[PDB]
Write a protein that binds this ligand. Structure first.
Ligand code: BG6
Lengths: 533, 522
């Protein structure tokens, strides 16, 4: 009896959240349709069948997935659970070999997999009863990241499994995951180049790189130069959290598969472009790690710029991965480096109710830090398509809501309807929930009147990490940052980053839970952005 | 009044019960138990208002005109002292009974509106006269002037709205009779005349009739009604097209590849083939309604939101059309359905033997102006087809690069009946696996969110806007598009293709549509 009340109460709060994000102006009809979407979301789940949707090419050669730092935090929370989810869906070959590689000694190996790895398997994956069947593919290798001799032994271990493959293709494909700090990558790749390359008889090698790719142009070019003598770009897969989201991948399709959007994607129709990233959480007591990164290096240099490239890129000659990336780097060469006056920075303080402590109230943050936890800036693309178009990138910690979306405003509708209408908007939201809607003006369906009584109406339309790993198995480099793409990305931000490190610009304080500095919203308004709400 | 208050309710209840019972009693018992559980601007009140419905004894007035007037009062859109006068040819010595047994019978939703029905009929009076007697219109004017002077308001006089629910052969006499006997008082008041039935059958026939009414009423007083010009989605065409930059920038020949305006009905002529045989499907709906839609689609941006500014642009684009010719038209005539439920058109006894009247017609129009040059506009209408469907389908040119056969052409659909809908068909990638991104699917982008069209038309007439009313110049330019073709049809140069009822029509129709820039992918 006591258990009944919790479920009905837990459901309505989810129902309340949905009717507040979609904002349907016919209140009654939406809740009925939205409610039926989540009824099948929790129920109707069984553990009877595992349909492997793998291509005939994937089962031809043995596959080996090596996760370096398997005892680490990133491997246990995200890397291994995603491999489990991929396996649950039947996306791994039946004879996949997974090897955990770490420095740490582990006795009672099976206890560790069940007590450490299985512990972080998610409740949403808990409807999997074949977890024991999945762990059968996992083995543990204790070695150092600097020993070519250990890699020769690892190679003997992988070769044992590779030669035991019951398929036509010989050799074996090897996907290496570096769930490690960036200071180790050059050492592991040198060691992998000398000790654990794929067999000469057949098999490719691919390396996934996770942690930040430097902190400036020089740091990244030094790091990219360390790996060039070992791996080309068809082998290096620089991963990104957002590129795997379906709505971000769909931007290429919504823009270029449709003439309606194609014809207005220029300066002659587009008036203001905004790419916003909002989080409710602060630094959560680990502000010391963030003090050396800043909000710009964290999410604006890599993720938001990755988004901005997909919006402004020219038409690729084809849908091939590197053809798409070429246009991605080419538009990133049409940008001007961000300047000091085109940037407004912020740093969050304690909340009004005191629930969220300030950034400087953290003991791990150095005293007198000018590290930004908020930044809004305008970029300029100098080409025939985007000349004069404002591109606003915004990122902020401990703000009024967690919200990640694109909001494009089209050119002001030149007076056939006057003030009765406003600017058209195209919205692409990826977080908290996927949604893509267009805001246009229609007449109010009550009476004809003067036809000046109109209303703004929206035209709605409804895991990332694991899909990206699969693209790596599938060899889809479309959603991975390229070397030239990374260096030209860095050249946009480094002059400003150097000015930030020398103290030329300092963040404006703002209480947690607000939108941020008052000057930021003014700066956005001063750069072609207007709203009527 | 301890007896009249009981009797008035008892009379109001039973008169509602009679209207509803159409089938072969026990229903009156069920309805009583259902009814047992059932528990304006200052300018509008400045002058008296008088609504005259000519031809009240006709089918159109009793079924459609007066029931719609009831809805205007239910919505609270009529002034509290409005005076409605029913004018008809036949004398009926059933003064109060006729209002309850004939007019109320066709009122809708009598299970909630039967308590304001008695207050509505109190505004209705009946005048029996001839449509040709200046003396009678003098007597009618003397009845109206008494109520006008009995108005408790600052402004004197009164406004008079005349409705001609009559065949067109009676219009010239009634407008002449109004001009000599029942014009508004010299102290104040406007006059407006609503005209419904077809305005001739060609350019000349329409021209003779338009010349007949000019010596009696100008264009600010003549409100030529059109059923669809008041439709919510058709009225919305002007807003969605110009209030939004997204649509404005693609509304030309550079982005648009084919436009289709389709009107589909499942019923045949329903044993009334004799009346339709002399009209044809082109004059019935294609010359007036579909072209009224077509005018709103191809009009340029009006200089303002003023009514005549919009109608000027409505006329200006209809003058850029070339008259439809014989090779750009496929006609059809329906035969008995495959299920036998719908008898053939020639199976009607009221239809002449060997008749070539079209029950189906698709034709292409060419608009020669900068915005639409080369854009095919297909107008299609058909009786006794696979479904009742009335919509606009604009197909844009798909840029193949860089998606090729993985994408198709974007579509804009605006449906007004049977159900309101405005959606865009685009291709997005399938939200499954990333794969090659060539795995896409065509997804439609639907629009999310008193009512009836006829009622709104009357109000716009009461408000005096005239945006949604056919203009004199607009009518002449509309006919000159269709008249050369109708003459070739009336001379037998083109003959309809037989097709069984329930199908899409003749197979040659779909070929003609396919041969003019329109593609399907299913
Ligand atoms: O005018 P019709 O074709 O007889 O049908 C009723 C129509 O009347 C209109 O005025 C209504 O808005 C529509 O709901 C409907 O399409």
């Amino acid at each position: 009896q006591d258990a009944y009340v919790a479920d009905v109460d837990g459901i309505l709060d989810v129902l309340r959240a949905q009717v507040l994000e979609r904002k349907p102006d016919d209140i009654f009809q939406f809740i009925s349709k939205s409610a039926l979407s989540l009824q099948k979301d929790r129920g109707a789940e069984s553990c009877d069948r595992i349909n492997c949707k793998v291509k005939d090419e994937q089962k031809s050669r043995a596959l080996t997935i090596i996760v370096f730092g398997a005892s680490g935090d990133l491997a246990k929370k995200k890397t291994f659970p995603a491999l489990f989810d991929l396996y649950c869906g039947g996306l791994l070959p039946p004879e996949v070999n997974i090897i955990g590689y770490a420095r740490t000694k582990v006795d009672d190996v099976e206890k560790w997999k069940h007590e450490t790895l299985m512990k972080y398997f998610s409740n949403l994956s808990e409807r999997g009863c074949h977890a024991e069947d999945f762990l059968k593919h996992i083995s543990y290798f204790c070695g150092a990241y600097d020993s070519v001799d250990d890699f020769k032994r690892l190679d003997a271990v992988i070769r044992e499994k590779e030669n035991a493959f019951k398929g036509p293709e010989k050799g074996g494909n090897r996907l290496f995951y570096l769930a490690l700090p960036p200071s180790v990558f050059a050492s592991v790749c040198e060691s992998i180049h000398k000790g654990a390359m794929p067999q000469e008889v057949g098999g490719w090698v691919r390396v996934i790189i996770e942690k930040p790719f430097g902190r400036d142009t020089k740091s990244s070019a030094e790091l990219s130069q360390a790996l060039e003598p070992f791996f080309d770009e068809s082998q290096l897969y620089r991963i990104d959290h957002y590129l795997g989201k379906e709505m971000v991948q769909n931007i290429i399709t919504t823009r270029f598969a449709n003439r309606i959007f194609s014809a207005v994607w220029n300066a002659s129709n587009i008036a203001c472009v905004q790419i916003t990233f909002k989080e409710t959480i602060g630094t959560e007591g680990r502000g010391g790690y963030f003090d050396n990164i800043g909000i710009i290096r964290d999410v604006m240099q890599n993720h938001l710029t990755q988004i901005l490239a997909l919006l402004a890129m020219e038409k690729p000659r084809s849908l091939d991965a590197e053809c798409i990336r070429d246009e991605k780097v080419s538009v990133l060469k049409c940008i001007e480096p961000i300047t000091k006056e085109n940037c407004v920075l912020g740093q969050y303080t304690a909340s009004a109710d005191g629930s969220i402590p300030g950034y400087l109230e953290d003991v791990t943050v150095p005293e007198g830090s000018t590290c930004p936890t908020f930044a809004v800036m305008r970029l300029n693309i100098n080409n025939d398509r985007w000349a004069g178009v404002p591109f606003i990138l915004k990122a902020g910690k401990a703000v009024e809501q967690k919200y990640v979306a694109i909001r494009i405003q089209f050119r002001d509708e030149v007076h056939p309807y006057g003030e009765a209408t406003q600017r058209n908007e195209l919205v692409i939201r990826a977080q908290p929930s996927e949604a893509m809607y267009v805001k246009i003006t229609t007449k109010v369906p009550g009476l004809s009147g003067d036809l000046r009584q109109t209303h703004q109406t929206e035209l709605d339309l409804t895991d990332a990490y694991e899909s990206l790993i699969n693209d790596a198995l599938l060899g889809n480099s479309t959603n991975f940052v390229r070397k030239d793409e990374l260096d030209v990305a860095w050249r946009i931000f480094t002059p400003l980053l150097h000015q930030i490190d020398s103290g030329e610009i300092k963040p404006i304080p703002y209480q947690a839970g607000t939108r941020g500095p008052k000057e930021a919203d003014e700066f956005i308004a001063n750069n072609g952005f207007k709203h009527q709400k």
